[PDB]
């Protein structure tokens, strides 16, 4: 549910 924690967090992040 976050496209932004998700498509730039685990996508970039983690």
């Known amino acids: 549910i976050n496209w932004k924690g ?3 967090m685990a996508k ?3």
Do not use: N
Request: overall charge positive; charged content about 15%; cysteine-free.
């Open 6 to 8: 998700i498509a730039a």
């Open 12 to 14: 970039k992040l983690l």
